[PDB]
Short mmCIF file of C-alpha atoms in Angstrom, two decimals:
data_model
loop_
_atom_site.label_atom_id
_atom_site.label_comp_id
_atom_site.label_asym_id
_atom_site.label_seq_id
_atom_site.Cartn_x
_atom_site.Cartn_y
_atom_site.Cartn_z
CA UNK A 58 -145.36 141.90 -42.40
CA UNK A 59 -143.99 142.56 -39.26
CA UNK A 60 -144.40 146.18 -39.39
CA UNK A 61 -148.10 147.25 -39.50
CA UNK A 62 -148.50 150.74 -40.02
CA UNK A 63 -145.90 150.81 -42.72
CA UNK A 64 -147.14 153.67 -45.02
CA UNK A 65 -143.62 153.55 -46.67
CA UNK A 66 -142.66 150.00 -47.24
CA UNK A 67 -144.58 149.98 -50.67
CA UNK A 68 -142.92 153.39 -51.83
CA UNK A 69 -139.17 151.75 -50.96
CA UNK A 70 -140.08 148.73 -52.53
CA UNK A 71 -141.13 150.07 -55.71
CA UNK A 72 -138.28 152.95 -55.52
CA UNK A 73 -135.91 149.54 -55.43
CA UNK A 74 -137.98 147.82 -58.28
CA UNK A 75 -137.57 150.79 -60.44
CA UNK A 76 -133.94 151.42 -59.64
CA UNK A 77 -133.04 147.69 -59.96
CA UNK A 78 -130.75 148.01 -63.34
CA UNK A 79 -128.48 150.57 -61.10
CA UNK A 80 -126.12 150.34 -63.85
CA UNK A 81 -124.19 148.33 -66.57
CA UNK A 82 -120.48 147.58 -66.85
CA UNK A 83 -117.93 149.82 -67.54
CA UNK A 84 -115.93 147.75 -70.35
CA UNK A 85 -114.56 150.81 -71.95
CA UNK A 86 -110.86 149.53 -71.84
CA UNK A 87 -110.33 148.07 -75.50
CA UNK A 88 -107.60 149.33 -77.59
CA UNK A 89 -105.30 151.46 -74.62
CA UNK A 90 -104.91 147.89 -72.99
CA UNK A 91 -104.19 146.40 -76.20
CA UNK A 92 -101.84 148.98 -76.74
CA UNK A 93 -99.89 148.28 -73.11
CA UNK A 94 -100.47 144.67 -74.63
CA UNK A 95 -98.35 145.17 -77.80
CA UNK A 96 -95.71 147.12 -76.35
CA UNK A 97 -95.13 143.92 -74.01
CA UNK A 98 -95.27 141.63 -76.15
CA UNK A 99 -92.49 143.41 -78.50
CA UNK A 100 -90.81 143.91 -75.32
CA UNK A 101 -90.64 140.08 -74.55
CA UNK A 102 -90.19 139.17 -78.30
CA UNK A 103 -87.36 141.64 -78.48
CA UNK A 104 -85.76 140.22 -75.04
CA UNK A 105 -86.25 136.73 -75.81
CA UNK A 106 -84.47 136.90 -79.12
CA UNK A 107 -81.73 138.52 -77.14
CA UNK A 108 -81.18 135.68 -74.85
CA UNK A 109 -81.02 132.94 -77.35
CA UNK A 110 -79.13 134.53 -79.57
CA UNK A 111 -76.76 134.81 -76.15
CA UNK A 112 -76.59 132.12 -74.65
CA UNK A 113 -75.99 130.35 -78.58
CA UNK A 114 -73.26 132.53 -78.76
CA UNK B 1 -101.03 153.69 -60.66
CA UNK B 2 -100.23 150.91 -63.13
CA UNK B 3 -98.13 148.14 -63.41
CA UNK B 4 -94.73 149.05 -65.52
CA UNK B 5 -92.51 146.17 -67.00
CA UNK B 6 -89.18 146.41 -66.03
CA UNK B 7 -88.37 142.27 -66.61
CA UNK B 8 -88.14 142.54 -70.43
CA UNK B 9 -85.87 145.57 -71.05
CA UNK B 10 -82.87 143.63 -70.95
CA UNK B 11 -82.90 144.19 -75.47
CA UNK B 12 -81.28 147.54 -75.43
CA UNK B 13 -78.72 146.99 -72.57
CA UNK B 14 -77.03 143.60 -71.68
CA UNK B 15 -77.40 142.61 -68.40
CA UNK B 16 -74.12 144.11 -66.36
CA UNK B 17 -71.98 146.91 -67.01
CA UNK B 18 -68.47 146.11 -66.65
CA UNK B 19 -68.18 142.31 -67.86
CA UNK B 20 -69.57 144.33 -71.28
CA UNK B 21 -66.44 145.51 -72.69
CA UNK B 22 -64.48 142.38 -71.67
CA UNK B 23 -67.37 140.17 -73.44
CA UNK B 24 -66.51 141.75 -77.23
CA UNK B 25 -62.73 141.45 -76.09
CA UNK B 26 -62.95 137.95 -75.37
CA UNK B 27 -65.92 136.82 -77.99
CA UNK B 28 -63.88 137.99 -81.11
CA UNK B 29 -60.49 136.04 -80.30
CA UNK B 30 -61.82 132.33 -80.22
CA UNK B 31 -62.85 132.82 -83.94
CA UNK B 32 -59.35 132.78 -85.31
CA UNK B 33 -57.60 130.63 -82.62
CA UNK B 34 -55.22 127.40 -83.22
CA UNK B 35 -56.94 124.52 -81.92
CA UNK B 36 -53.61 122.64 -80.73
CA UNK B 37 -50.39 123.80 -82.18
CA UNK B 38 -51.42 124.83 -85.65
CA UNK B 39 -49.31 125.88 -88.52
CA UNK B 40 -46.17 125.06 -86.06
CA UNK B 41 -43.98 125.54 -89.47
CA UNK B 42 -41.40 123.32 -87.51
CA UNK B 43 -39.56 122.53 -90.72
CA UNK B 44 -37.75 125.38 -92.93
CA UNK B 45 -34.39 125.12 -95.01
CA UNK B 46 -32.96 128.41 -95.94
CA UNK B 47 -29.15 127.65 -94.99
CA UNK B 48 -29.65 128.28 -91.78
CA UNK B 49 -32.64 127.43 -90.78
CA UNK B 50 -31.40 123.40 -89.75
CA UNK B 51 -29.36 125.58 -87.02
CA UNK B 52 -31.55 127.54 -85.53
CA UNK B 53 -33.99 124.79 -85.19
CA UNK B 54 -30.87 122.08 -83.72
CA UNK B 55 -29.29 124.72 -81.77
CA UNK B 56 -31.23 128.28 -81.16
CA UNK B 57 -34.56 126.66 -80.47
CA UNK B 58 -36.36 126.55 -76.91
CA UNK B 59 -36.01 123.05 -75.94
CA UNK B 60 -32.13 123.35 -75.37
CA UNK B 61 -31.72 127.21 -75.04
CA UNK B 62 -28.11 125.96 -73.48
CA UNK B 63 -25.00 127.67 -73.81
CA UNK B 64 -23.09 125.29 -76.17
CA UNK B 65 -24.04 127.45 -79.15
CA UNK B 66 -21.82 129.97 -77.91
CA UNK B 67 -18.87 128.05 -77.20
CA UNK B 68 -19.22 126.81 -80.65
CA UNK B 69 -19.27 129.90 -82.10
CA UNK B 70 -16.15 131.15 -79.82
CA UNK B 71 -14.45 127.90 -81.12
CA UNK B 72 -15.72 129.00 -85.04
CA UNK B 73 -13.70 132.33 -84.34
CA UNK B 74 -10.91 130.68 -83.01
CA UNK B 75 -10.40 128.51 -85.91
CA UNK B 76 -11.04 131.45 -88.49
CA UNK B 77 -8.58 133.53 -86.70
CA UNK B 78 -5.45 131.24 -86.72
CA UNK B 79 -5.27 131.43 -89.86
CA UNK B 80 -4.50 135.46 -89.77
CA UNK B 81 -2.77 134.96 -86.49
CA UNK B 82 -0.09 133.41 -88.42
CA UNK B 83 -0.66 136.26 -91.34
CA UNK B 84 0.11 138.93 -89.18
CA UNK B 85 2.58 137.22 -86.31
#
């Protein structure tokens, strides 16, 4: 309101409006994370059976 | 770029390099170890045995066994001292 001879302010506005859903979440990461996933857990499984088994013995 | 995972990969090496070889020289020997003195097979009889456990054992180790023996061959000798001269 503050401007008065805008001319432009309604063409932004509805340049916003239409470009409001910019854009949607990239969750595309779902099985190459898993996979980093499993190979840590075996990891930790792997090194954790270690250690007991260790420090039993 | 990523995060790699060094604090699990202790599985396919043990954790130091040298104490390694001395901990499969020093696991295997407490297996079949005497827990205090056993089997000490203190006792035998074979003729001589009663001596060597009286005389030649390690509580004495003196030098009497000697001068026993020294007196043995002085006694078995006499007897062809006066064979000969």
């Amino acid at each position: 309101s503050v401007l008065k001879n805008t001319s432009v302010i309604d063409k932004i506005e509805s340049y916003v409006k239409q470009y409001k859903p910019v854009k949607i979440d990239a969750s595309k990461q779902l099985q190459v994370i898993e996979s980093f996933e499993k190979h840590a857990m075996t990891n930790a499984k792997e090194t954790e059976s270690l250690v007991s088994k260790e420090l039993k013995d | 770029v990523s995060t790699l995972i060094p604090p699990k990969v202790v599985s396919s090496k043990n954790i130091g390099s040298a104490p390694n070889a001395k901990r499969i020289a020093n696991v295997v020997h407490f297996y079949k170890s005497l827990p205090q003195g056993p089997a000490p097979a203190i006792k035998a009889n074979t003729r001589l045995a009663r001596y060597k456990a009286k005389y030649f054992d390690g509580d004495n180790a003196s030098g009497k066994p000697l001068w026993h023996f020294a007196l043995g061959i002085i006694a078995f000798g006499y007897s062809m001292e006066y064979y000969f001269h």
